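Q: What does the assembled structure look like for these inputs?
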Amino acid sequence: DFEVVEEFTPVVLATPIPEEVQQAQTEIKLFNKWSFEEVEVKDASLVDYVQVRQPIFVAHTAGRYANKRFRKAQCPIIERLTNSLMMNGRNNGKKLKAVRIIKHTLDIINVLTDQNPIQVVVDAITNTGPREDTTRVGGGGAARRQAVDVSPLRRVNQAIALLTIGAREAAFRNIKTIAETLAEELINAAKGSSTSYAIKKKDELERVAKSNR
Amino acid sequence: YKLDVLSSVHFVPKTPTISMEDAQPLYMSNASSLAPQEI
Amino acid sequence: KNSKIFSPFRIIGNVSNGVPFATGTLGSTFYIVTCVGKTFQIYDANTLHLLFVSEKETPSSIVALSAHFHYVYAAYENKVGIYKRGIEEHLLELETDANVEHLCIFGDYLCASTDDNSIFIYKKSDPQDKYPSEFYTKLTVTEIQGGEIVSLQHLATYLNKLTVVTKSNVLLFNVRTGKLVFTSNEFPDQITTAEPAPVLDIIALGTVTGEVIMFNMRKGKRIRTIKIPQSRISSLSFRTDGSSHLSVGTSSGDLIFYDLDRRSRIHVLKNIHRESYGGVTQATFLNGQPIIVTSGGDNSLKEYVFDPSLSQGSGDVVVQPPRYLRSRGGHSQPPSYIAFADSQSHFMLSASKDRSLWSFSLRKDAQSQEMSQRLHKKQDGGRVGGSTIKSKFPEIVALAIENARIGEWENIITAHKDEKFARTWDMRNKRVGRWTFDTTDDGFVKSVAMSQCGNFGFIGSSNGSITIYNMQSGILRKKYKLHKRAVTGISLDGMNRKMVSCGLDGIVGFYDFNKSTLLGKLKLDAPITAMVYHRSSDLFALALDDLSIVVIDAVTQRVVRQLWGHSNRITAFDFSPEGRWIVSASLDSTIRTWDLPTGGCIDGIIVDNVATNVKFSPNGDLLATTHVTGNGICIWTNRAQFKTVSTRTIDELNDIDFNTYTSLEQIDKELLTLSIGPRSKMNTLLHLDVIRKRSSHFTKQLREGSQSKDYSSLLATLINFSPAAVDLEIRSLNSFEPFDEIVWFIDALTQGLKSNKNFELYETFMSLLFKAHGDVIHANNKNQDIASALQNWEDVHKKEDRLDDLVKFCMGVAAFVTTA
Amino acid sequence: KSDFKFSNLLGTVYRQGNITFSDDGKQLLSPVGNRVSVFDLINNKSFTFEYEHRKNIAAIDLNKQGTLLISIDEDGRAILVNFKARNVLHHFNFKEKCSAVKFSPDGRLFALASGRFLQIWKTPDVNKDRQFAPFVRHRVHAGHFQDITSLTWSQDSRFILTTSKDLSAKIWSVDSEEKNLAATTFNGHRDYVMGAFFSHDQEKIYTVSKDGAVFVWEFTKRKYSWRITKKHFFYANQAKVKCVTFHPATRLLAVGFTSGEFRLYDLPDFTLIQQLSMGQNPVNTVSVNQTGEWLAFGSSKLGQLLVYEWQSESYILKQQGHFDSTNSLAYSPDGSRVVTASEDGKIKVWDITSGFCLATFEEHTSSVTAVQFAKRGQVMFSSSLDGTVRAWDLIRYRNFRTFTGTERIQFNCLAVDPSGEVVCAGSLDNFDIHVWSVQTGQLLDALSGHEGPVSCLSFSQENSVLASASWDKTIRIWSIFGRSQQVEPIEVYSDVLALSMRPDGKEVAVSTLKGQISIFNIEDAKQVGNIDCRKDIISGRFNQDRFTAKNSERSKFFTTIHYSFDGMAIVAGGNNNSICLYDVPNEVLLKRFIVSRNMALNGTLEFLNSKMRPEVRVTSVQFSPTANAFAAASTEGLLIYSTNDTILFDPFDLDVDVTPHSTVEALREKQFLNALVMAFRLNEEYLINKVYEAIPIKEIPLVASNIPAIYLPRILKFIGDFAIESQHIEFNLIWIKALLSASGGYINEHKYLFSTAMRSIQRFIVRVAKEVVNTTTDNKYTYRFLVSTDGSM
Amino acid sequence: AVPSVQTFGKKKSATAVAHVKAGKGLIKVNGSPITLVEPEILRFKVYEPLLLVGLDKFSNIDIRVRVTGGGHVSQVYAIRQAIAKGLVAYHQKYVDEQSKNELKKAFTSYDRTLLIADSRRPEPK
RNA sequence: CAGCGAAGGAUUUGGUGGAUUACUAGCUAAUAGCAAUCUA
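A:
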């Protein structure tokens, strides 16, 4: 048929480079394990806000996303998960610890549910983000709520927030750690099991909006 | 003219009835080009 | 066959062909007139500049040419032409059918020897005119008196005599009395050349064995003899600046210099010209000067100079050898490949079978220069191979020049005969480059190309594999393997985005270039021999083996034209620079032009030599063809750059044949139509008072139209004349007692704008009427004739709001669609 | 797309040389620097010849058949051009400075004054093919001792009368047999003889000199031997004669002096018909019409060109250009005229078709740096070095607004709002950006944050975000409107000159001093892609400098870039003599144009002959908003490069059955839509015009509704470039109405495809059709008044 | 005597000098190989100038990086910047400009902070 | 050392010739003469 030759000598270097590292020059995988192609966002209106189309090697892109309004809609969603994981007074700044426990939770997500953990966390985002909410229409403070819709950036924000703080309180004083509780949370949120803090909170917010619609 | 022609890079060049008024604007056949407010 | 697109202009790159040239002397300067086939060319001997080229090609080859002061005498098939400044002044028809093949000019006499050993003398009419013109007598050298006439000369101070040098004898004729004065003794070997010495009544004879005789034409003896064993002598010249040297010229290409005073041999210039092309054909000293001009049959004309002697007291015995001075030259073999170097049609690259790449100038023949083959240094520092005895590269199959990055790096990429790598060249430096691109499959290079970014060169091997190298750094970038038989054409888009290859298995492959994919593959019905990509219109043409030319576009990958008509193998073809025509040339001795819009053959030329190369200029100026015989490049100019040619097919809606459409005057009688004229005439008419402040036949035709009730001639005169005339005719219209001329003008304008033509002018004529003397119409308002004339004018004019709401719709909807 | 050819040369109506008229004196031929411009003064249009001398041209003549021109430059390199085909026939080098060239009245000979030799050559045919040597020399006469200043042929092309710097004038017969009729020489002048003319009957000879004497020579007796019968003097004291001409039929002697004053006399009686002044600079050229009614004067110092009718004392045109001093240009929002901001302090509004200046504006007291249009051609803003931005109404021609700062700085670039509330301007000595309201006059803001001189400003045309870019290697994006005060700085590799902005406001292309054009996404401030342009730049070698053109760092970067209106291309120019255009998806050079081959300019030759001058530079480039062209403000003038569809066969998916023959068979068989799409696939202008006119009015909307969407911009841009000059106004408006009604939603959702084809259509509706509709409306209302009211006494 | 090239990579206070020259293909950071650059979770931040363009660009050149200052993540960002713009500058000066701006296009499409840092800050609102 | 490597290789330099603008010939007292000479 037709084939292109574009290297003309088997490439060998003087510094020995590991075989999986030099295998990573044909496709960029997260932590050299998890592929970014065939990772779709199975809910439209959240594609163009959960970003999985520039593959990365680690969740530590030091780029600047907090100086325009919707610029954090194209931080990769693994890194948005990581950044939302490193928040409380105890664990502020510790992005390498957050990256390391994201690596551990994607390994154990894959070893429990034998599928792509990036696809699992993307399904967890698109199942967790609430599609309706209530504002408090004031009237000076008349305690009545009015149901509003909710924009997709707010849905991705509140999805990552619900998932991460659900993993924190689920790891609060049990035997499991943050990596294992976050793995359980992301798996249950991906399949949508109503056993997770995150989609129970989504179902409560959507049900209250349905109530005082 | 002479101080800014030597303070520059690129080159700068320099009775009968009428001097023909070679330079003159306003003309696409305009006569009353004043504003209605001006009038 | 005469053509109707291209007309012959010149045949460039030619300097000599081995007819012995003539020298001539205007004042104290010298010119050198050399024959190039059927034209001669005059050169300025102080700098070898081309002064003149003869104006018309002679009907056969020029075979003997001489030059007195202003005039050049060129003898071809039967007749002698007398030329001044190229333009022919006279033509002397001889009364024979024998071919004239020698001539001399002295006095009032021109003497021309034919090849049946007859001599024709021609005389001036009155000794003040410029050239010999009338027939005088005929002389004959019969077999008793001498052999074949081998030269015809007049050695000086011989009152109307002629030295005729036959192959064995030397005769001396008196050309007024027609007599044979003196016939010498015989010579034991056949003499080939003669030259008169600057010594009085001495001629010098050169034989077919190796000896120069110095015959004394008054004593009848020979003065001395010079022996050059096993060398046929083809030239003789004498030095005339106080140094008695002789220069003999030998048909193995040697120029030997003798001192006659002290009988020694000064120097030998060996291999001054090629023996295979004739050796040194004419060598002559410019007289009084130490410079000698040689010329050979290898299309070359050189000058050699004697420097003054290096010993400050002896001099005459220490003779410094002759050194080289200026020279002009071209190809010694017919060229094999042709390209244009730039878009200006100034230089053209040209490769020949004598293994040289020349760069010939179309503007000034002094600028023609041989691209040098002196190799660079190796990049790492290792040794380069090759023979020590340096020879030229194998003769060039193909080349591709793309001067986008010219002067920056290597610029020409060329492919040679039966060798597996393609060299590069630099046109700016005019030299070879540092890189030779290999094919990497042990196959010869069948095609080359290069992109118009100038970064990439493409090699197409005979084992079907395209390799893409970088022209700057010389290394393999990519390698496509689609074909299995030889790849004969590679080209690429003007945006470096899609490449197109064609092999002689008859598949055209279409590849994306940035991505390394293929976009498609199209199987034709013959092996493809040559591709030409027209790059602006993205249409490439293939010369198939079934003697058709398939024109196919690269965007949608379809065969879009197929041109039939050639009877043998298509040697070459090329697109017009506008991409409208394609000119092909093939081994049925023909050149055709195809209008690929209509798909037919516009013009055909039957040319006697087969045209092996055809190239258009990158502007529409010139066609350059290259034939099987002839060392030069034939140059044609397209007459369709100055006129327009009909795209109507030859063998063996005139506006659509001349590609025009004269727009018809009005499309429909119910359609408004402006004037055929400038748009500004309405504004000039409406505001010519303020414009200038910022700066009768009519009455007779109006009356006659009021009689006949048809104002067509009136309105024709109105649309004809100028705005000052229009204002001055409308302003004087008898607005006083019965008001006839006003109402005749008004219903003339009514008859006018009933016809829906020139209607903006009829509108301004009504505006000029109301402006000039609408006050009298307002004065005798309710007058019956003028009120009825205005009534029917409004009756026709009220149907003009079609234009109003039409432009209202177009303006409103165009604004809405553009903004929102 | 990329197949631009040199169309026109706006600006610079005259540089150096002699003006010529046509025979039917409708066009005048004017030597601009090394081109030749031809202005048709009745059919209001103009073109410039494509060919190019290598030095400034000094002589022009075309024969009175109008069929071929010959132009000689200031060292004798003649060029013979076919005047109708507009293609050059021959290049002939006369060896020295030729003062005049003239064709005979019978066209068949021309003569020229090369040095002190009068040489007559005979004219090659226009019908003959090009030869290697088409000129055949008639003779060369040498009787003058110094250089010949003028020629004059007689009425019959039989004698020629030449004037020299040597203080004589001579008469030579053309042929040898009349040598005895013409062998005299005419002495008596104190200075250079500037002209020598015959009378109508060729009995009197008038010889005008530089000091101011005109001598009348007659063949009288005091035998008969050419006495001098009367000397008349101009008595202009300080000034002296610079150019003379004579119309022998109307007996009109026209004389221009070195003081701008020209006088015109009725010659054998020497009565001053008129005396008036061009200006203060000398009158370098006088030329006269064949009927003698128009006089064209050229002054060479200010580059000005009058043609003036002396009967009706009035100037047909007054047109002064700008050599070498042109800082900016801007197309009008329909591509009908170009506004030029020039270094002598003035704005000039040049029509493009007719190559002349409509209005000029001198209220800046220093070099105007930038012009920019706004409010859809109603207002025009300019900023200069005298410290002012100011606004110009192009209706009432008034400077109605002037904006200054508070710091006394000089402004180098500006940018206006789309919704023209705010003007904005940046300097090269202040590091701030000055933000003025246009409605009130006040200084609305001073934006600060650059640490280097703000080289360029541009407002995004759609979302109205400001982009500035400065020599601190930084492009910066300011959200000004609506409570933001937001600043986004994008750093870049080197210092920026000429930012430019996409028509949709999505991206911004900056030119840097490295030599590159980088293209950035505005909203997500990351680089989309760059072009590396410093190796396809032609940087010539100056005469004064001692470093090669390869190693020079003078001009290997672009100081002005501009987007195409479909957003897909960038034209670019700088201080070099190449202008380059690229397509920004592929980042590849489409085409590079050599802006000058004049060796009289400086940076033209890369290699100087081994045997200050005005350097060549382009200061502003812009694309045309309506028709597929660009203007470049070089030193020679406003170079206008445009494609045309008459040439270049470039089809669009034709097959073997798609043919002009097939198209006219489909037209004769009246499948009108099939004929229209066959002509679109041919993409042949005559075929599209033929089918377009052959479709009837009854079924314009069926065809226009069934046109496929890929052929929509072709039919729209065809209708635009056709309907500007075509007479079929209702036919073209019917087609426009049918296309806008049938497919005017596709246009609105594909704005930038039809962004130059729709601007060309409303260049037809408001500029010819609305003028006609205005005239018929005024006629209707004057009728209704003149018949509806009471005129009694 | 050798064709060599020096570039600089900076983040907050780390700074890395990279010398690139022709050689056998060895990439050495602070004397040790590139496969030892701790904190070992950002070793692919260091690797991505190699894996973005292929190791066949590095098969003929040897790089050495000297990194001072900063912290762990500032040093890996300085290393990757120095490696990236050193490869670009080597292919500019000693290989062809087409591979030069192909490398610039690949690095700029990944992130232009491999080639241009974010340097002077803050903003005074 | 390996490698490159055809009766040698590298570096430096002086001189000359040709291009560095697009080729209609020299001289003079120039409608022609001269160019061997303008002068009786």
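The interface with chain C takes residues 24, 27, 29-31 of chain B (CB under 8 Å).
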